[PDB]
Design a protein around this ligand. Sequence first.
Ligand code: MG
Ligand code: MG
Ligand code: MG
Ligand code: MG
Ligand code: MG
Ligand code: MG
Ligand code: MG
Ligand code: MG
Ligand code: MG
Ligand code: MG
Ligand code: MG
Ligand code: MG
Ligand code: MG
Ligand code: MG
Ligand code: MG
Ligand code: MG
Ligand code: MG
Ligand code: ZN
Lengths: 66, 116, 83, 177
Amino acid sequence: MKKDIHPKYEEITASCSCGNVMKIRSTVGHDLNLDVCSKCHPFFTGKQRDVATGGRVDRFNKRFNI
Amino acid sequence: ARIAGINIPDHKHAVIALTSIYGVGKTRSKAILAAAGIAEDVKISELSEGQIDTLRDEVAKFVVEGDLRREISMSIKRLMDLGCYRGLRHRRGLPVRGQRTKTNARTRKGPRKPIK
Amino acid sequence: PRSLKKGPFIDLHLLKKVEKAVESGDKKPLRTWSRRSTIFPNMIGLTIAVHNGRQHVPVFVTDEMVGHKLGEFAPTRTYRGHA
Amino acid sequence: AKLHDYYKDEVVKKLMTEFNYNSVMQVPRVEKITLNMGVGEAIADKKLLDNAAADLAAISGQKPLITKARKSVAGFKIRQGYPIGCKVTLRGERMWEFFERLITIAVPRIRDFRGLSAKSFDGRGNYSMGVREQIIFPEIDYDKVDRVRGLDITITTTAKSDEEGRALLAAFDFPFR
RNA sequence: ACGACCAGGGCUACACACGUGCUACAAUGGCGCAUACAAAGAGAAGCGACCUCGCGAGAGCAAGCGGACCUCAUAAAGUGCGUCGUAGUCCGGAUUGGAGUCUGCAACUCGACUCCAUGAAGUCGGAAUCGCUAGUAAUCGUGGAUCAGAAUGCCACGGUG
RNA sequence: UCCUCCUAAAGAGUAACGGAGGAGCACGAAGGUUGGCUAAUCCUGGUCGGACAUCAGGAGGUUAGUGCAAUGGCAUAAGCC
Ligand SMILES: [Mg+2]
Ligand SMILES: [Mg+2]
Ligand SMILES: [Mg+2]
Ligand SMILES: [Mg+2]
Ligand SMILES: [Mg+2]
Ligand SMILES: [Mg+2]
Ligand SMILES: [Mg+2]
Ligand SMILES: [Mg+2]
Ligand SMILES: [Mg+2]
Ligand SMILES: [Mg+2]
Ligand SMILES: [Mg+2]
Ligand SMILES: [Mg+2]
Ligand SMILES: [Mg+2]
Ligand SMILES: [Mg+2]
Ligand SMILES: [Mg+2]
Ligand SMILES: [Mg+2]
Ligand SMILES: [Mg+2]
Ligand SMILES: [Zn+2]
């Protein structure tokens, strides 16, 4: 890379709510606190839940009994 | 200041900046802060990140932006596909709830369309 | 809508016609003036010609058509446009 | 070089197994990542281009190459030579480190993230995606920015087919669907 | 049959134009808590306490009352404190989705109300135009008729002024 | 008046109130040199982005380009940085 034209690119630490401490090289400078990472993202549980059609006959039979 | 995907203004209070979430209102925002043990008059500033993690978990208890918009579009397109009266109103752009269409249907019908 | 404690509503003559066409296993179109009858889950798969004021429009009955009434699938006002 | 080491140790063994290649050089590998921002609105002001390149320099720690119009078209009101976009080519370690921050940080920060497409592989393994909003990278400060940009990421790899790249990214647990 | 009976539909449609109203565009205000002061009315197929349950509309049991006795029924605006701090906002509440209650054989077309969510237009209105001279206008609530249910309309009542 | 092609009969040249088009400049770099590069178009994928901007790959192989008319040239590029 060239010398002067580029921004400062320094290794910092990014910790998350799941405690995923990860050291990366970045242009942030300061340390970073995340909210969700790929470890704690609900891609492996929430997307399983996320179809959510629901039943019409079962809602009907749910509302009462004959 | 980043809940459920989106950012949240810091200068506002707690219940209001939560109500910025598509899916909560003043009631459910009070239920959130009550379940987190957080007062409503404090700001999103001077909050602990553990307090915000509790807040994120409490919001994650409910149905929100992408989920809620997906469920809403599914219910409307269910009526579309059935071809009921509510579906026909939803796809003619007319009011569903039994209002008048002779006059004052301007929310569903938009601005005025002049006869040319 | 109706209270849950009253349960649903359906005409008796409709519910008897449904029980007959179920046991007979006929898929004949049942013409019906009961636009206010709630669809039952045992009604799924039937052609029912609901009245509209002028004629009987046939409605094939789907699962999703359960928690509704028969009148929702028989529109009474014909509108095409002014121009 | 965390993912480059993870490549060299586990992905090559995986793909040699799941494809039964004669040679290890026959395996796919990533080659470059190209980051374009097509800014067609800079004909209003240069500063929109000048600030979008500043934003993209924070994402990837390189000064972006301001791209220009190859020819002149009148539907877009541009002449041949006008600066009309910006790109960044990423190779080597800076490529791997960006690709880590991408699939680890920024993709989870997508609003209503629900996966990628497996139908974005240009017939020859090279994958292309487009992000709607630059704030998913944490390099950008939310108060400091004003305009929602968007960019597109293009991962150019050495995979001959389309599935060998699909399996390669799946080996990097790339969230297709 | 231009007469009579029944079911269902319609009188509620919708490119649009007009009239009369309601609610607003906020800070002389919105919200939250506490608290003070009315008049005039209705009630037996009715008014319906108290207590319990419900976030709620309401449900159950259930007194008293043909009523200066009981019920509808706590008047609100106001005042005291805190809050927001000029933003399409903690303004505004339309619309739409879901869940419900009640009336009634029956709320799909086509009821009212509640709860959760949603949060349009609108930042004081062109040409033009209306009402009002004092307890008036303005504004704030209250009640009744019709009525199973269903008024922003109508007819009445007092408060501030 | 000047330029390009045909007529023009395979050297040159060759007429008509014959058939068709242009010029009466520009450039202090659009010149010199060194070094490097190689198009048009189309296909697929891809945020705003659209028949058509920018990006990545592939076909193609000069069908492009040449300061301007036409003809002849041009990859060792005379084309492009
Ligand atoms: Mg919200
Ligand atoms: Mg009428
Ligand atoms: Mg409000
Ligand atoms: Mg009454
Ligand atoms: Mg209770
Ligand atoms: Mg007060
Ligand atoms: Mg206050
Ligand atoms: Mg609302
Ligand atoms: Mg507006
Ligand atoms: Mg304003
Ligand atoms: Mg007078
Ligand atoms: Mg009534
Ligand atoms: Mg010759
Ligand atoms: Mg000769
Ligand atoms: Mg000859
Ligand atoms: Mg050269
Ligand atoms: Mg493109
Ligand atoms: Zn994480």
